[PDB]
Amino acid sequence: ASGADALKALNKDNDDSLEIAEVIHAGATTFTAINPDGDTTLESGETKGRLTEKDWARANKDGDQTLEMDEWLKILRTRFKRADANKDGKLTAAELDSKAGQGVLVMIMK
Amino acid sequence: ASGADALKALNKDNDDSLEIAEVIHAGATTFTAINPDGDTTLESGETKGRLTEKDWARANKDGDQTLEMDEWLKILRTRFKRADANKDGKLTAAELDSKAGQGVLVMIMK
Ligand SMILES: [Dy+3]
Ligand SMILES: [Dy+3]
Ligand SMILES: [Dy+3]
Ligand SMILES: [Dy+3]
Ligand SMILES: [Dy+3]
Ligand SMILES: [Dy+3]
Ligand SMILES: [Dy+3]
């Protein structure tokens, strides 16, 4: 998916950008959408192609093999900062289409 | 409620315990249940009696006046650890009934 696609689906206010509240909420929706096994936890197989082993090492600090909702969203907030090249707390289409923005996109859209 | 009543509410027996995945999932449901204004954000008036000013200062690091889901759940994970007096990763009824356990209960049930 592209940045224009994400704005079309996830932006409901009268702007051209995704703010952190919009991004976190879409991350929470996506967590459930990519979790087909009927639990409340993401296992490593469920996160392939969206998260790296380094993301798990950084965010999963509780000794389990499960990403709970908060550990997933922690990674997303870090990725938001990396994509927000002009520091204004808003992700525009150009920021979403950048390499760092692609990392946000894979956590906010199935 | 009490620890026993909280365990019963989550379809568990009186001598059972809560682990972090069930607690985080219940915290995520509670976030939305205590948020009656149609947004995706908890304002301070929505968290009175559940969170302190110091909780907001620790968890709300983004310069806004709003708790997103990840900031709320960060506080819950901190409270789980404080209520887990023996640090075994499980909260018994007695741990839930403690003063620190009360702080978990106000975040996992309306
Ligand atoms: Dy917006
Ligand atoms: Dy799963
Ligand atoms: Dy975990
Ligand atoms: Dy920006
Ligand atoms: Dy609200
Ligand atoms: Dy915030
Ligand atoms: Dy314990």
Residue numbers in the entry:
A (entry chain A), B (entry chain B): 24 to 133
Pull verbatim passages from the article behind this deposition:
The discovery of the founding member of the LanM family of lanthanide-binding proteins demonstrated that nature has evolved macromolecules surpassing the selectivity of synthetic f-element chelators. The natural lanthanide-binding protein lanmodulin (LanM)4,5 is a sustainable alternative to conventional solvent-extraction-based separation. First, LanMs possess four EF-hand motifs. Second, adjacent EF hands in LanMs are separated by 12–13 residues—rather than the typical ≈25 residues in CaII-responsive EF-hand proteins—resulting in an unusual three-helix bundle architecture with the metal-binding sites on the periphery.
To understand the basis for LRE versus HRE discrimination, we also determined a 1.4-Å-resolution structure of DyIII–Hans-LanM. The structure of DyIII–Hans-LanM confirms the importance of second-sphere control of ligand positioning. In EF3, this carboxylate shift lengthens the distance between Arg100 and the proximal Oε of Glu91 from 2.9 Å (in LaIII–Hans-LanM) to 3.2 Å. The rearrangement of this second-sphere hydrogen-bonding network suggests a structural basis for RE-dependent differences in Kdimer values. By contrast, even though DyIII induces the same overall response as LaIII in stoichiometric titrations, in the chelator-buffered DyIII titrations Hans-LanM exhibits a lesser conformational response (1.8-fold increase). The main response to DyIII occurs at 2.6 nM, >30-fold higher than with the LREs, and with little or no cooperativity (n = 1.3). The apoprotein and DyIII-bound protein weakly dimerize, with Kdimer values of 117 µM and 60 µM, respectively, consistent with the ratios of monomer and dimer reflected in the SEC and MALS traces. Thus, LaIII favours Hans-LanM’s dimerization by >100-fold over DyIII.
